[PDB]
Amino acid sequence: AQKTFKVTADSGIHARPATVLVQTASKYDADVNLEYNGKTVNLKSIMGVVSLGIAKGAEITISASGADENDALNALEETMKSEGLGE
């Protein structure tokens, strides 16, 4: 019920990736959260990720817990490589 992605976008994760990621996760009622720096935050938060301070060449772990938790984590995987944001 989770996965790991390798941030490769040369810039980090700010509002550009936080807006496209919050929209995809919003499509699923499951609880999608983002784990980074040993801290738990919400994938639908633009300021929450900014507090983490994610940068290029980083590692994160997504998690889903609900009814369509499976379609949410795999739906974010194709959305990442589709826009060249992570892998």
Burial class (CB in 10 A: 0-12, 13-18, 19+), 45: middle
8-state DSSP, 15: H
Name the residues annotated as catalytic. Answer: 14
What is d(CA 5, CA 60) in angstroms, rounded to the nearest whole number? 6
Q: What is the CATH number of domain 1-87?
A: 3.30.1340.10
Q: Residue 2 contacts by C-beta under 8 Å, 6 or more apart in sequence?
A: 61, 62, 63, 64, 73
DSSP lists the bridge partners of residue 46 as none
Which residues, 6 or more positions from 7, have their beta carbon under 8 angstroms from its beta carbon? 13, 54, 55, 56, 57, 58, 59, 60, 85, 86
Q: CA 48, 1, 28: angle at the middle one, nearest 5?
A: 60
**Given its phi and psi angles, is residue 18 left (phi above 0), alpha (psi -120 to 50 degrees) or beta?**
alpha
